[PDB]
Symmetry: D2
Subunit: 292 residues, 4 copies
Amino acid sequence: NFDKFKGLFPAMVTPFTKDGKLHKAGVKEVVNFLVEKQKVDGIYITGSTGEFLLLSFEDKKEVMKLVAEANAGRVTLIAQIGSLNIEETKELAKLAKELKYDAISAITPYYYNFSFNETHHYYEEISKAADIPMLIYYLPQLAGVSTDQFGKLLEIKNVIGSKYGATDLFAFERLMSKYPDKLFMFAWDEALAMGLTMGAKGFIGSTYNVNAKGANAIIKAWEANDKEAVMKLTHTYNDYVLDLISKGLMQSLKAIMRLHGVDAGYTRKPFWRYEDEEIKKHAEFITDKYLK
Amino acid sequence: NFDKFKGLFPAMVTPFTKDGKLHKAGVKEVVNFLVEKQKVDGIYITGSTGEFLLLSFEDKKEVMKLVAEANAGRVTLIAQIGSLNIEETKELAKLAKELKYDAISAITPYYYNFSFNETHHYYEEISKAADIPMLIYYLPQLAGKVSTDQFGKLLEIKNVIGSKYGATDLFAFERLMSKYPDKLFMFAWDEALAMGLTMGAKGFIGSTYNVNAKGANAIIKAWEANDKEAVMKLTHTYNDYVLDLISKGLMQSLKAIMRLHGVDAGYTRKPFWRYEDEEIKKHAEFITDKYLK
Amino acid sequence: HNFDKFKGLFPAMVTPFTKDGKLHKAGVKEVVNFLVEKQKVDGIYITGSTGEFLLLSFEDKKEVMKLVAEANAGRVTLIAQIGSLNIEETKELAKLAKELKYDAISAITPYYYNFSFNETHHYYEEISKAADIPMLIYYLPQLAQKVSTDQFGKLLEIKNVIGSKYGATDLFAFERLMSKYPDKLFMFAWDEALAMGLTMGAKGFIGSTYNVNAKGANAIIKAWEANDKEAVMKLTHTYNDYVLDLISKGLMQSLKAIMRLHGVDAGYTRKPFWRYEDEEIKKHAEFITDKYLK
Amino acid sequence: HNFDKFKGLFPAMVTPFTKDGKLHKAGVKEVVNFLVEKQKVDGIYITGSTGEFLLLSFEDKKEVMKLVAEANAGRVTLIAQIGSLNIEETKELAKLAKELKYDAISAITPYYYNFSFNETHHYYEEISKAADIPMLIYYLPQLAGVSTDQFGKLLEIKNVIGSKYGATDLFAFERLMSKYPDKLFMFAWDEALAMGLTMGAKGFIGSTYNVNAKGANAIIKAWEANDKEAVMKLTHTYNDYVLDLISKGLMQSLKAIMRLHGVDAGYTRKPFWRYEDEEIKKHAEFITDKYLK
């Protein structure tokens, strides 16, 4: 079953010290905050929100092991392990398998307009590296890609589905219609209820790091058929999303966590470093408005 | 309150003869078919689906009168009356009121990139014409974008009751629903009907309701009934219909299906492509048999 | 060389209206006289975007065409933009242009709806049958799906079609068309890249900005023909400074106010275009004139 | 004040790799020789997109810099693209550039994330303190949602002598030449070389100059010589060549043309497509025979 892939999966921040060192103690404290205080169903690690492009190859493995250790099998684990370095991505798949990750994902080849063919080969080679379920990222165009064409990706060995993060809910509806056998994790935080309505059961998002409660409220209202409440709670949540990102996203999440006694550290360069007081007031503003 | 604006409002097609004359007896038959067979809650006339840019000023007034007559107060009526001629628009608004149209709408100034200020003045002028509710079109960007806030100044213009929202941007729609709960937002994106209902839309305007009101009403019914899985299944079927339907020109396909049902809905006007009779007839049957049986 | 009459600057002529909104028939003549005699233009492109053609009635259009013919009295080349979604009207406009001795006609792409290639091809095909007068098609990047260099050639092969008015800011597509179709005429309608156009073989230029700055635009051409490459640069910076400054207020309101300042009865824009306060627009007209048109 | 060293053709060098992906070190030298002696370039631009920089390790990059500084021995101008999301590795690479007497460095726009202006500025600010070597910033249309004025504050940062301008936007290029006459802008759009010339570009960086520098020098010479018609005809041939070249993958076609001239320029690194060996060689043979004889 995909039962373990139901519910909320924050895209986990990766804690760094002020000087840009991987803050190992922080990683564990974050995982504990998510499992125990946020009460998440799973954790999605080393994605965009985890600052993965700013992590060294060894930083990556360290975080994967540290997370595995802190979780202690309590919640579902997914590691985002894709990069342009195919050999590193292969070892990472093995390491995910070894550490008992529930699934992996790999972001679409970026920067260059890599072709459908190149993308297919990218994902094909990675599937032979280990037997661990794979989620691909949704990709509208590569050099110029039909919902039929994306099906070819979906059928590669070990691929169970797709992380769907595009703002295009018609494509999402078309995929849910064509591939009812595949798992689609919905990655568009401000359209959670929309997601639910076309059959999404699992959600990966940055914003669930510190407001799983507000997101679960929408899901619980939806299952209980309180349609008015689905609307009001969504308006509130999307208020929260927009207030949140009036300062840098990862700086805000890390500050909110620090305000809650979690050692979540700081972003790396080149992300902007705010004055401690400025980001503290922002953390308080979000916390007081939304997270009581 | 806004109760008369609940349900389905097909964007009515405008029947023309094969040589493109306004087919006056066709207009009334289409109205009958929509009320009697599609069981619509309302009808939305002379928009893009009604080929309004291909109508003369005299055609527009005539269509309004023929619709008003055949309807006979049975369903709610909204007239899209906007163009670049502000005096013709004002006159169509007074005619709307006279004919007891429930609301009017006007498309955004088009072709040129008209500024916010110009668009606001254009709607302001229209409001002083007749005392009838007005729905403005939703506006993403105006000669370089318009916020939730900047758009609200359009919503506050005298007689403006709300907006016809057709954009495929469901976040923006959510934002408008939050900020303006006292305004009427008619939802015009047929393929996101259930997603529209989920965020509070209660009225739906669209070309696809001309011949599949039953299929869209099925979605609405399952939604109000809390049948989550039927909402999904019926939307999958309905959107299959939409993609199948527009594999030929929309209005040719919609008029061909009406003719197939024995309704004198006529044909489109130049420069829309005119298909061979048998090709468009087979398309019509294909749609009918697959979805409309 | 039969395209000789299509060389040089072709202002996209404004259409004078009264403050009321009426077609100002006397103004039409004065504008034409202004452009021939003071701007010393090579031709005039009438009832295009800049001529507010979408706010013109069918009669207004025929009237403007007749009046421009009469005022020009054959002095310069005349091209009439006549396209609309009313095909029977465009057909009559094509016959009228022929009757009035216009040198070419043009027709905008079918707009507002996403018309397909086959619909666009059929539209242009029906027009070409109406009268024996040279046709310039508008350059079309994308119709609802991309239009290729090869696909646009199917439009250029329609009877009477001699070329294309090319307005996109994509100068690569332009280089490609001049390479593939040197037997066709390409009227270059991106004023802020005049010298770029020259460089790739453009000899005719249709633009809003030549209504009041034909001298500035001619200086760039002359510098280029004289191989004064530094001056091509300097004269472009200046000209483009002028364009940006000009469109700081609405274009057509700016163009008409600049003409009115020079004593030309150019009138005003129609609704829904913004009507500026009397003095605000005059002062704008003075600024541009003092800075660029001395 | 004097930018004489940066006039002419500056191919974006390819980075040679073995069939199985190692950094073919001697291959780097055979390419550097082949561009200097046989393509007759004025300069080389190393470890850019065309040099597959994102597929190179930190050590790889350091190695390529050293190898190039060696095989050139000061014969042509050298520019290093050294930018990445690791600020400390860029800070180092700019000291390595200053040490190997590189004439210029550049750093790409922070990529993948939508980094803001403030972030972009601070990142160039940081890279400058590292080493007193002149910097060329990449031209940037938009950061996280970008004034020609704002882009000037980036030009003001210590050690910045101008910009690598690659956008297909010839208007904003004309605008930049107008406002900052005291700055070097290297023109990085191969298909509009003659249009860059027209507005004052004097140095050119690009991937196509790897195997057809002669064909592009032909355009510059005709231009300076005021031969208007040949500028046109020679541009048309060059752009036929460019569209022909990129009918298969760029780096694979280029590397394969080089291997065809007995230059050991190897292959691309994963994830780039690897062609069946007869396919890309028939492509190498076609381009060479039609354009490079």
